[PDB]
Design a protein around this ligand. Structure first.
Ligand SMILES: *[C@H](C)[C@H]1/C(=C/c2[nH]c(/C=C3N=C(/C=C4\NC(=O)C(CC)=C4C)C(C)=C\3CCC(=O)O)c(CCC(=O)O)c2C)NC(=O)[C@@H]1C
Ligand SMILES: *[C@H](C)[C@H]1/C(=C/c2[nH]c(/C=C3N=C(/C=C4\NC(=O)C(CC)=C4C)C(C)=C\3CCC(=O)O)c(CCC(=O)O)c2C)NC(=O)[C@@H]1C
Ligand SMILES: *[C@H](C)[C@H]1/C(=C/c2[nH]c(/C=C3N=C(/C=C4\NC(=O)C(CC)=C4C)C(C)=C\3CCC(=O)O)c(CCC(=O)O)c2C)NC(=O)[C@@H]1C
Ligand SMILES: CCC1=C(C)/C(=C/C2=NC(=C\c3[nH]c(/C=C4\NC(=O)[C@H](C)[C@H]4CC)c(C)c3CCC(=O)O)/C(CCC(=O)O)=C2C)NC1=O
Ligand SMILES: CC1=C(/C=C/C(C)=C/C=C/C(C)=C/C=C/C=C(C)/C=C/C=C(C)/C=C/C2=C(C)C(=O)CCC2(C)C)C(C)(C)CCC1=O
Lengths: 300, 57, 161, 67, 160, 160, 161, 161, 160, 160
């Protein structure tokens, strides 16, 4: 690609050398914090000036990857390990690599990618390097970022990264919901996330009825099985708060509000799902209504 | 007068020497003439009246 | 030129035989791969210039080839090299669509080695550029279609070198 | 340079063409002065009829400057 | 027009319409309802798609809107989005007709010369059309998005 | 050069050189001293012309060195200056030869294709050439720079 | 082709370097010699047919070449020989004006020996004809312009041989 | 000639650099393939006569070529065709061992087409015979080494064409 | 290499390679890891080896850098260091190839004539190569040092 | 032998052995133990190996022992077995020497002429040697059998 600076003293080559001296963890944290500082103390990314189509397939694969494997792939790129994604990254231009990392950071901010571990703090050396980068000029900043990030990925004939990075060791945990502490709805949320609908729907009453958004209620246990297995397929929910009270016939009326990060009837990620649960007194959900409350975004 | 130990220390590989067409020759000049970029002009397409704001002549 | 269908038909005709089970199986395999071939061809046609640009940047730019004294020095020579890479990509797409390298032999590789030898075009540099094109096309198209395009681009490389 | 705008109708005599041939059957073209004689000879030898000829460019009797 | 392209090819070969070409015309006319639904959606949603695509394009290529660029200035941005709307309308024309020929006729032949004279970056125009295609794909179904992707990618490739 | 161009035209017409062509060659031969003076000044001050022209070009069209621009970054700016140096050298060759055949052959034929592939604004390159021409004309005398600027103008017109 | 100016420009370009002192010196030398070359070219263009006539007369008239059975016997063969001589005179004049011999290789010498060997043309006879052309042109053109013209004609003769 | 080692060494030397990681990977690949190359060479040396015999029987015998008026009619001409096939097989083995098709280019192809054109040898039929040799060698050596041998056999065919 | 030499001998005799050559080739191919490792050692130590060898050579022989010496002067001394680096690279090539043929073909044929025309003392060049061999042996283990010193002493003997 | 062939090549080049040639000589010296082991195995099992080889050849090609064949009668069978033993001893000599040079110079040069003089089927002799190789491979270790298979194949090819 473009000629990378290696050793000319000055300031930019010195900064690039310091970044190289920093280990894999320091380099990855430094690039993440630089992306965080982008637009305020660093140059704004302009992905339109690079052929992002080449990295589009890798980006989609990463997005489809689960968060654990997402972090594993990113750390593999940082460590320059031998992986197909590392090969694909190494087979890119510096601009494409920088745009790919920018897209990864944007997806991490939007939640589509597994984010940085919470409460992480940049090391002293990495923070000093980041301060030097901020002191640098805009063109100097972009040159430093490009040269620092080009070396990542796996390339034949090159092998280092002795420090290495063994990453860091939701659905399995209880769904964090405010004001709702009922085993029936908790199991419903967990089973819906796990997509094991055959075991999920036992929480439904025999006369259980489901109310999909924009559609009339569906009644019948096997009808709800069919609805789950044909419409609600592999979607992730993020319930936020909830209220519970009694209701006529001994029922339990529970209104839960949360966010769905998975494509489900539109308003992707930015739709508030309201679960209206008229649960039977014995516990099984007699009526479940899924209401896709929308933001000012329209055209649903 | 000339000292050879200095150049023995200052030896450089031949393949590392810059040639005529290399942009690294002008890298130093570009560093000297520090170009000032444009501050990003935050603009929202949503707040733009296409029919009226387009020029008429 | 011959596609896979025409190749199978010619193989049957040479022996004067009707299309038997094996020929039908080969035709079925080609028909199965047809959708992937069409999708890859459309993707390459869309990203034609981008693929060549990325390949030349990866393999040729910032080198003795582009610097004075290199083959890709003058603007005319740069344009000629870009045109040659465009022709290679387009004819590789044709070969991938047809499932056969007959078009590559008939309209590209015939006398191409002699042409570069007379012109002074660096064969190794051109082969590296085509390898870069193959990698870019693989990353831009996928795994199976990328593999097929790599097969035909390596066919061109073998013919050239 | 001096140009001739010529309209002519050249018929076919040997084969019954099944492709659209009106464009070269009846047409008008701008032939150069230096080629007009041989073009006229070709049309006559093919059997065409020279419907019209005009001097679109230049003026008659130009001793110099006819380029 | 797919029918017009078939007529042109048949006349070029000096033959009547092939059975396969007639079958293709039949299938296109049968599916014309679904095809024209996409055009209806695009016409209805022209404003939001154009504005969102323009904002994303400016995010991707801030230099064009920066001072000294072609699109710098309120009027320049307005006319850039106006050309965006032109190309969206041409894409709707193409999806309706089933052929890229109307797109190539009205808004594609001579575009290089026009934008060279205006100083516009044809690469930036292609990126903007790419953003428009992505937004339309988001706003439409997967099958309809894929169908319109053919016309959008045709415009993209002809741009660059 | 002018000799080669006249020879090519004469052989295309299948004739020896006309009195006009021979007189043009002899006049060029007589005036070659001023051409060599122009080349000497340009080569001696080439770093100055390139530096000042790059500064003026970046000032006039800052989006080039803005984020998302082609000349963004130290390496991109260096390559910008390198292309400016090639064009100055080609201008010197054309000035010495008395004909712009070498400039056309080396850095004008296919320049559109090369810069389109690289993503560069050809109008920006022409602006850089104009800046170099202004700096050189300031560096030289009136008539000398006056007839040296013709080749700069040719390059500017051919690129823009 | 290429003149001396083109040669200097090409050398400087291929080395990627500006015109240094030596290139300026060579350009000054060519400019010094240019008026001479223009005078010689004008003289030869004025007297193109004549020089050919006395070249043939001193070289080929009343000889075995012009007898029946020679390659220059028939009227058509004499016309062909005259056309060859006129090509050689014209291109030697072109090389004289350009100060370079690249034009002869590009146009004349690139296939002329194989041409005469396929034709049966007597290369010894044509060498004698051009050698006589040397003195015939030198008489009209002078001594130093004659030296240059003889240089180019010797170039043609050596290429033929 | 040049093997893989000398080829990579020359590629590094021409641009004047030491051996980097990329070149060392190529040498490691060649060393990995060396055992297979030696085994294939031993097998082909053992079955040299049988391979050519089977190829001739499978492509040329009982065709127009052997019948009177064909280019394999006289016993001398038949032995010449056998000798040509022996050359092609032996040099394909040489190139397979060396990992580079340079000995083929500098000792089998440079002018061989001209010699066959002068002698009237049918290049298409000799290409068919070389294809038969490729098939027999693949059947006798295995897919992995058979493909490598076929690479250089096809190189010879392309050079002939 | 041994492969090239054996193939050349087989071609000259117009025969396939004998098993006595094939097994040698197999052994050479198998024993390539150590040669490669010595290669990376030398290439990594190239700068230090060249510097130390040149320093030791100039200390031992002052006339080379003395006034009137072949290497007298800045550019002359740098060029002598360049020659040392050349021969180190050739030695690395030979070590990797397991043969001295690449060294002999690249920088060993006509070396006497070349340096005689240059005026350089070939004996001093051999002394420089000897110092380089000593440094390489110091930087290498006992077995690897001997193996590399084989090529080093071949080069030294061929030089003088 | 490999050693004598390397010495001959070095003498022809008029030079000492290269480092690669010395390494190959050392490798052959190291493998001499395994070569001697294979020779010991063959010499120990000389009788049985020739017995099974002769029986297999007789079964494969009965026309030799049939009336009118060259090896008809007890004396002819004894001569055939003696030739078998001679060739097996030659194979052992070649395996010990590390190259087929002793085999070629003892019983492989002029073999075709000698069998043409004696009327013996050269193809039959080659098949007999192939049977010997098969029985030896069955009798000895795979690695030793693989090493001797190259020499056996060389002998059979030379007799083919
Ligand atoms: C038949 C109903 C009438 C008739 C026919 C007739 N035609 C010609 C000659 C020509 N006809 C055409 C017409 C066309 N050519 C085209 O390409 C198309 C458009 C797609 C048309 C309509 C032309 C151009 C000619 C010129 C000759 C040629 O075909 O190339 C003739 C005379 C042919 C000749 O050479 O003499 C005749 C007889 N004659 C009648 O009396 C009917 C009323
Ligand atoms: C006589 C009717 C006219 C005339 C004649 C004339 N001719 C020459 C010289 C030559 N004439 C020829 C012609 C031919 N040679 C051939 O082989 C053929 C066909 C068989 C032809 C027609 C040639 C070749 C020559 C050159 C001399 C030579 O051949 O050796 C001359 C003398 C020219 C001179 O200056 O030497 C003359 C006078 N002159 C007239 O006035 C009559 C009209
Ligand atoms: C019969 C006495 C012996 C015999 C014959 C036999 N020959 C073949 C095959 C071929 N024979 C030839 C020979 C020639 N062709 C020529 O043009 C010349 C000179 C005019 C000669 C001597 C050739 C070329 C062939 C190849 C096939 C072909 O003709 O195209 C066979 C068949 C071999 C096979 O397997 O196909 C046979 C049987 N066989 C004997 O056993 C007798 C001693
Ligand atoms: C002698 C004739 C000739 C020309 C014309 C030429 C042009 C040229 N400019 C290049 C790159 C480049 N050229 C520029 C320069 C510019 N950026 C801008 O914004 C400006 C408009 C413009 C300068 C005024 C840039 C930025 C690149 C890098 C492109 C990239 O890396 O993507 C390259 C490819 C990289 C390389 O140089 O190896 C070439 C061949 N080379 C030649 O041999
Ligand atoms: C302007 C402009 C551009 C330039 C654009 C630019 C400058 C683009 C650059 C954008 C930047 C700076 C992107 C960096 C992103 C960093 C990421 C994704 C790191 C995440 C770290 C992770 C997940 C690790 C977390 C961690 C875990 C998990 C651990 O296990 C341990 C700790 C740790 C913290 C390491 C272009 C090039 C596009 C075009 C030209 C142009 O002009």
């Amino acid at each position: 690609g473009i000629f990378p600076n290696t050793l000319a003293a000055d300031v930019v080559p010195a900064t690039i050398a310091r970044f190289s001296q920093l280990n894999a963890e320091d380099q990855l944290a430094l690039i993440w914090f630089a992306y965080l500082e982008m637009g305020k103390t660093l140059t704004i990314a302009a992905p339109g000036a690079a052929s992002m189509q080449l990295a589009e397939n890798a980006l989609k694969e990463i997005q489809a990857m689960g968060p654990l494997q997402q972090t594993q792939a990113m750390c593999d790129l940082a460590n320059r390990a031998d992986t197909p994604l590392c090969r694909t990254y190494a087979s890119w231009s510096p601009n494409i690599k920088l745009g790919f990392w920018y897209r990864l950071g944007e997806l991490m901010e939007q939640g589509f990618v597994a984010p940085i571990p919470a409460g992480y703090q940049l090391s002293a050396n990495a923070n000093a390097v980041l301060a030097t980068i901020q002191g640098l000029e805009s063109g100097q900043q972009i040159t430093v970022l490009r040269n620092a990030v080009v070396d990542m990925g796996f390339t034949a004939g090159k092998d280092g990264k002795r420090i290495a990075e063994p990453v860091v060791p939701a659905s399995r945990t209880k769904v964090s919901i405010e004001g709702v502490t009922n085993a029936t709805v908790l199991n419903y949320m967990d089973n819906l996330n796990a997509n094991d609908f055959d075991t999920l729907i036992e929480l439904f009453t025999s006369d259980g009825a489901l109310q999909p958004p924009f559609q009339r209620p569906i009644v019948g246990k096997e009808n709800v099985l069919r609805f789950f297995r044909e419409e609600c397929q592999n979607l992730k929910l993020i319930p936020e708060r909830g209220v519970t009270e009694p209701a006529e016939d001994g029922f339990t009326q529970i209104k839960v509000t949360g966010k769905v990060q998975t494509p489900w009837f539109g308003g992707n990620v930015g739709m508030n799902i309201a679960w209206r649960f008229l649960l039977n007194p014995e516990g099984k959900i007699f009526f479940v209504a899924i209401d896709l409350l929308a933001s000012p975004k329209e055209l649903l | 007068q000339i000292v050879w130990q200095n150049e023995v220390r200052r030896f450089i590989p031949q393949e590392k020497k810059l040639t005529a067409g290399n942009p690294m020759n002008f890298l130093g000049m570009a560093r000297s003439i520090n170009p000032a970029a444009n501050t990003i002009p935050k603009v929202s397409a949503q707040n733009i009246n296409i029919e009226a704001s387009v020029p008429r002549r | 030129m011959q596609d896979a269908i025409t190749a199978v038909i010619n193989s049957a005709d040479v022996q004067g035989k009707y299309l038997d089970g094996a020929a039908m199986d080969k035709l079925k395999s080609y028909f199965a791969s047809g959708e992937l071939r069409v999708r890859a061809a459309s993707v390459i046609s869309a990203n034609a210039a981008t693929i060549v640009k990325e390949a030349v940047a990866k393999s040729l730019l910032y080198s003795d080839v582009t610097r004075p004294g290199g083959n890709m020095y003058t603007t005319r020579r740069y344009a000629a090299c870009i045109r040659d890479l465009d022709y290679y990509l387009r004819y590789a797409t044709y070969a991938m669509l047809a499932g056969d390298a007959s078009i590559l032999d008939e309209r590209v590789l015939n006398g191409l080695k002699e042409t570069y030898n007379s012109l002074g075009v660096p064969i190794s540099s051109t082969v590296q550029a085509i390898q870069a094109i193959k990698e870019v096309t693989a990353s831009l198209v996928g795994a199976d279609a990328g593999k097929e395009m790599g097969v035909y681009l390596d066919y061109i490389c073998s013919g050239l070198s | 340079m001096r140009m001739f705008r010529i309209t002519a109708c050249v018929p076919s005599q040997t084969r019954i063409r099944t492709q659209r041939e009106l464009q070269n059957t009846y047409f008008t073209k701008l032939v150069p002065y230096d080629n007009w004689f041989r073009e006229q000879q070709r049309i006559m030898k093919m059997g065409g009829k020279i419907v019209k000829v005009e001097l679109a460019t230049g003026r008659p009797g130009t001793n110099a400057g006819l380029a | 027009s797919i029918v017009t392209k078939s007529i042109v090819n048949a006349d070029a070969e000096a033959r009547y319409l092939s059975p396969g070409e007639l079958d293709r015309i039949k299938a296109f006319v049968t599916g014309g309802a679904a095809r024209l639904r996409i055009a209806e959606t695009l016409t209805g949603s022209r404003e939001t798609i154009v504005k969102q695509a323009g904002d994303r394009l400016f995010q991707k290529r801030p230099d064009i809107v920066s001072p000294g660029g072609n699109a710098y200035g309120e009027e320049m941005t307005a006319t850039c989005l106006r050309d965006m709307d032109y190309y969206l309308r041409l894409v709707t024309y193409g999806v309706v007709s089933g052929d890229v020929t109307p797109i190539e006729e009205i808004g594609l032949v001579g575009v290089r010369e026009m934008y060279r004279s205006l100083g516009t970056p044809i690469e930036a125009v292609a990126q903007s059309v790419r953003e428009m295609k992505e937004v339309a794909s988001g706003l439409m179904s997967s099958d309809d998005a894929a169908e319109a992707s053919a016309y959008f990618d045709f415009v993209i490739g002809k741009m660059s």
